[model samples]
Target: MRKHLGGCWLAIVCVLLFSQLSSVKARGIK
Candidate 1:
């Protein structure tokens, strides 16, 4: 249970970073 918690958090962080960085590369950050 607790083990999966970190995994979920990491996944969410990865997703957020991926989304932000990808958009940044394609366009200007505003």
Candidate 2:
């Protein structure tokens, strides 16, 4: 169960980072 929770947290962080980086790139382009 610990491994399962660890994966879930990692996925969440990855998604958050992806979206944040995408927004930053768009702003930089503009």
Candidate 3:
């Protein structure tokens, strides 16, 4: 159970990091 929860948290973190990277790239384009 704990391992499953950790995996979910890691997924969320990865998504957030990707979003932040994309936003930075978009701003650079402008």
Candidate 4:
């Protein structure tokens, strides 16, 4: 159970990081 929760948290963080990276790239287009 602990391992599963840890992995879920990692996935959430990774997704958030990717989203921020996409935002940065979008800003660069201007």
Per-model TM-score on C-alpha atoms = 0.45, 0.46, 0.46, 0.45
Report the lDDT tens digits of candidate 1 across residue range 1-30: 354566567986676776778785674233
Clash count for candidate 1 is: 0
| Quality of model 1 by C-alpha lDDT | 0.65
Clashes of 2: 0
lDDT (C-alpha, whole model) for all candidates: 0.65, 0.63, 0.64, 0.64
Steric clash count of candidate 4: 0
Residue pairs in clash, model 1: none
Q: Against the true structure, what is every candidate's RMSD?
A: 4.9, 5.7, 5.6, 5.8
Native-to-model Cα distance after best TM-score fit, residue 25 in candidate 4, in Å = 2.8
The parts of candidate 3 lying over 4 Å away from their true place are 1-6, 27-30
Pull out the clashing pairs in model 4: none
The CA lDDT at 9 in model 2 is 72
lDDT, candidate 3, 1-30, per-residue tens: 355566667886787777777776474221
lDDT of 4 at 3: 50
